[PDB]
Amino acid sequence: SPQVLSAIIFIYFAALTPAITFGGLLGDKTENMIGVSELLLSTALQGIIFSLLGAQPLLVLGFSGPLLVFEEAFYSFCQTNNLEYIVGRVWIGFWLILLVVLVVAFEGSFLVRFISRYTQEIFSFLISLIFIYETFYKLVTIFQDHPLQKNYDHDVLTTPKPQAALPNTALLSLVLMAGTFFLAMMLRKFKNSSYFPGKLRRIIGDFGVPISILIMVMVDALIQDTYTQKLSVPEGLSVSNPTERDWLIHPLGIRVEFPIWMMFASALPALLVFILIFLESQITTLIIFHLDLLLIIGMGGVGAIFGMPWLSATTVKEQRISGLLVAVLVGVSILMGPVLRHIPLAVLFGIFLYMGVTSLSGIQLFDRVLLLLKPRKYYPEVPYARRVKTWRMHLFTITQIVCLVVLWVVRSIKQISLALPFILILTVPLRRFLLPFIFRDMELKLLDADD
Amino acid sequence: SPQVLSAIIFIYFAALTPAITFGGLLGDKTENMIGVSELLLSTALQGIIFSLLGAQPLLVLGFSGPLLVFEEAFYSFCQTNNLEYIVGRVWIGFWLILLVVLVVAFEGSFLVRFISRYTQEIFSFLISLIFIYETFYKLVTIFQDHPLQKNYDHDVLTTPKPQAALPNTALLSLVLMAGTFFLAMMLRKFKNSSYFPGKLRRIIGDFGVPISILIMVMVDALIQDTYTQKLSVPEGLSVSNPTERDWLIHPLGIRVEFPIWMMFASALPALLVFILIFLESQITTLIIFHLDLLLIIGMGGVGAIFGMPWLSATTVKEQRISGLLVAVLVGVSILMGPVLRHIPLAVLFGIFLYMGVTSLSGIQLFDRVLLLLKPRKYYPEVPYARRVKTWRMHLFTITQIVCLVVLWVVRSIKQISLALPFILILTVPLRRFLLPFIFRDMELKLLDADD
Amino acid sequence: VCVQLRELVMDEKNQEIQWMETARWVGLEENLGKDGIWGRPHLPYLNFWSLLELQKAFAKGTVLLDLPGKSLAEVANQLLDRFTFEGQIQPDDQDNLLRVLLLKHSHASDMEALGGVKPVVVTHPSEPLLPQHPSLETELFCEKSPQDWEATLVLVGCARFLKRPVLGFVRLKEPMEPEEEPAVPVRFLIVLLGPEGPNINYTQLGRAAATLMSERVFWNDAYLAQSKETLVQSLEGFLDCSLVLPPLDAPSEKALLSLVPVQKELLRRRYL
Amino acid sequence: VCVQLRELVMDEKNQEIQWMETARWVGLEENLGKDGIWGRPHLPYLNFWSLLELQKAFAKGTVLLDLPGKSLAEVANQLLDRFTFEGQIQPDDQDNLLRVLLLKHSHASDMEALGGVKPVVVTHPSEPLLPQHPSLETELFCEKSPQDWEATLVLVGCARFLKRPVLGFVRLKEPMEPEEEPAVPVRFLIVLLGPEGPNINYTQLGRAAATLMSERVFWNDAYLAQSKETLVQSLEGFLDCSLVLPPLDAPSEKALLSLVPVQKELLRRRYL
């Protein structure tokens, strides 16, 4: 039906848009080990396997930034010492799979009963902050790679990688990403505005991000004289840098023999990733059960077999057909490599920054955070502040802030990394034990009152 | 007193900021005949002469864009045929001065009783549109002067003028002006925002434009490797391009003998300029009398004697001392030529564009113009639309729009120019005769109801 | 002074929307019976909600003193212009309201000439959906103007499409006789309209307005009204002399006759 | 059932802010006089605004049914918590109000032990600036039953710093005797506060609340109150049985004694 015709394309766009940016980021952090296509196939197969077996087939299994954060932290750690990233990840997957049965024998979803708003809200805020910090660090990267000069060099080879800084790039890319973010904001406000009658406005507002990415691509096409960093997409059904990885992966290593003492030592990261995905799931379960959760964990563990990243839950009978269609369209999307290689990276970074900012805008914790600076004479009437002393809420905000700052510091230090989930998790008992010791039950029933 | 200490500096900044951009524009349109310094001296002497003799010494005599528009139209006409611009302007001044006595003998301010909101509002809108169009045409100029290439040439002499297109300029200047406009908008919103307690915020908000111009100058100073188009300021008490004009001007011409048949034929432009300044004055008189008006006209006529542009009214006992101080500070400002020559032109263009946009924002006609596109279900309650049929107001808007389009077309055509004031003025009788013939008195009492 | 109140109704014989008089005030209130004789003269009594809503309406009510009008068509147009001018209404509804403004006016002599009178609410006609009726005054009681007694006509109707109830008063430059049956010239005119709403009895509301205008001081105030504020002040003083009687489980005619001195006190205050 | 009303006042002998009883309801209203003893029993009468404002207050009034309270302090604290909880008040004023909530309570036996009783408006004490003090009852009338008279105490005061008048009612899980002089246990409590405002007579307002609660059906409704809505509905029924007496230029005791059947009709409706 026409309703299904529009919905399938809308959901396909919504699912494909973040995937492109995620794959671009993965290709950026990795040398070329993981790009878009591998994760694209992973989610392609994920959609169909989940739709066939799923308590809620209407749900979507996309990818979330914290997964990328953990993956890049693992990449950094593997860069600290001579290690095989992919094989290590495969071993982590093995640990996941052997862990799954422990929960299959007896449910372990009890912690679902021990989740709090105060924890997940600040976690999301921290994730947004890290998004912004990475986006900003990219500008430093470009400035250092392309120092501001006036002479430069002539006819520098740049097909695989720019051998020398060239003019028209350290600033034009900034223009591209800034325009992307600006237009995304404009289209968001327009969607939330009074222009055009209802449906006529919201129909295009829902596709703002899908549509506010092609204008910059057209501009880049019109300006073909100056090189820009774009996608290095291989041919169809071909791995990114086949000289470094193939579809078939040797657990003993392809170029280097994986350490034996690291075979059985890969358990520690797996539980972290498991906890991350577990806490991620319940958030998407709120719109309205260990079978679906365990299925997702098993699928994530399997996804590492051939060298693809794991996925995560995302937003929203013919339910199974819907999942089937989006998954098959995702699989088909792999074929546009030639045209997609014209797409520059600054656009992806701008879209990622816009997504992070918009995700931040949905947090009430940030609202109260910014209200702290706001004078105590114009606070909007919210049924959690008018009945509470302002300074008390400031104390709660400062506690959250110091936790966030400690997490940020841990993130900054490279030697001590991959421990962020652990330090974050030990916060929940603090909310369950320390917070009641300081604040009244009625007081606490207004701040972290999850709905 | 400290209040006077702050007010004098604040008004000095407010007066100097637009003068720099106006002088830069004059130097741009002219080869080098008129820059900043000449107009700077003109206003320097104007302030003191007006403060000593003025019914309202608190008023300010700045410069307005329409004066520049008329001057550049005259420059274009003088470029059409072999003519002397400066001598022609001096003769126009003579016509002004002999005209002044006609009104001195008997007042001619009757037309002050025959001014309407509908005319001046659309006039201001058109002026803003022309500002934006000029700013955009500058980008075309730069693109043509600096076509996008990859090779260019080495060590091109650029001290007097770039002999060849060079890298790092056709786009970096765009970045500079865009940043200027962006920061100006940010500081404006911040001023109109809730950040910081009252005075602490508005004190810097009032200086946004004075302050959101130095950051880009500092950036340019940090990036000294790439040439940018900047101010060509001569030494103190020296005319811009003395080989082309001196303080003493021969009415018979300095390099070419002025046509005799154009001596007595210069009357026509003078009355246009006179009408322009006359209509400009009453707008600034609204905050709360032929003596002050005639004094201003005479001063404008005199200002052309030595080759300086005329000034115009601007925004806001010690009143005489205030005018004295700002005028003397303006005169002193001429001495910063060496440092000012480091200032690029893109900053001035960005500030000019921001000023035009902000001036546009203050027009209610534009509000109703944009409301026309807005659906007829969310219009804010204004006590001129809820009592009037929407389509009728649309008819009024379309009449204004077609008048504006005709004015724009006349502006576009170079052969037919300098007639914009005449065609604009004949609109007032149309409002006084045609509009009542179509619309009711009660209807018309709501749209152009000037306060 | 003579006051007469008319309700927007539809006769059952011709099925046309018209205005039918419901009560008159000549010295004392005479309520018009169902068919078709007047009731006994009696002193008016009003319910809370009618008063509450009237005060609400009069807070933003429309008043057109010194109206250069002499006919129902002229005053109708000027009131519509002011109602829009005050943002009270949109221009779109003026015509249908103007259609209502120029409907026929039936009188007691025509009551037996009509098949029946029932409340009508303006649509686009219809009947009120809220649980109103029956009229108390009709159950209770239905079972002289050489000069100064200038006529006053009050019109009450219901219009669902209206957003809020609207109050419209006109004081003509000269009292005029249009199309009242008695030879009494009309100077003061009132029109009360609005959508159906809880605690909104248009009948009681119209009775309250007639009762307020029946006040001799309020008459004088109306004659010497220069702005809406003066009428608002006259209302407040009138409302300062009101004395609500809450329900009481043990009625006593002795506890009554004790509020008569209070009544006297309030009426003395009204006189000041 | 017994009902007693107390006003926040200051004695002229000790100059301390206290609560002094003004009237009592045991079968019929006895108003307390100055040096004179309780006035004669009489049937209550109320003015318009007092009622108007009461319904305004009760539209957003606070009610605490089956409250686990047995003393003044406990119930005082729970009401302050709910008043803030309902956004009715800010937390800052709680302490001063709590100070008022725990003031001494004087009785008729102590009236001659005090130099004088005058209205007090809470500040930061002061006196009302508005032209009020219109009690009327004293001007009119002032010149042992615990079987089924579950005591009810109503407290009325004025506090300028408050933004709007506030209504607080608290139904206790068990009727309790705190610090009423008669051996009657208190279960229903009411506190009415607010800033000084036009048409706001706290005395008349408190009398109106006591009169409403004096309703035998309203008593039953209060006993079987489950939510604020039921009390609101009981009020509206009580309001539907109200019959306002407008001032009348020609008083007649014959036109009175005709509203007695109407009174009967209204009470019958109240009983339904």
Residue numbers in the entry:
A (entry chain A), B (entry chain C): 420 to 707, 720 to 747, 775 to 909
C (entry chain D), D (entry chain B): 67 to 190, 194 to 212, 228 to 263, 270 to 362
Authors' account:
Mammalian erythrocyte AE1 is a ~100 kD integral transmembrane glycoprotein consisting of an N-terminal cytoplasmic domain (CD, residues 1 to 360 in human AE1) and a C-terminal trans-membrane domain (TMD, residues 361 to 911 in human AE1). Here we present the cryoEM structures of full-length bovine AE1 with its TMD captured in both IF and OF conformations.
3D classification using the C1 symmetry resulted in three major classes that differ mostly in the position of the CD. Two classes showed fully connected CD and partially connected CD respectively. We have previously demonstrated that there is a flexible linker between CD and TMD in the AE1 monomer that may play a significant role in the red blood cell elasticity, providing a mechanism to connect the cytoskeleton (given that AE1 CD binds various cytoplasmic proteins) with the red blood cell membrane.
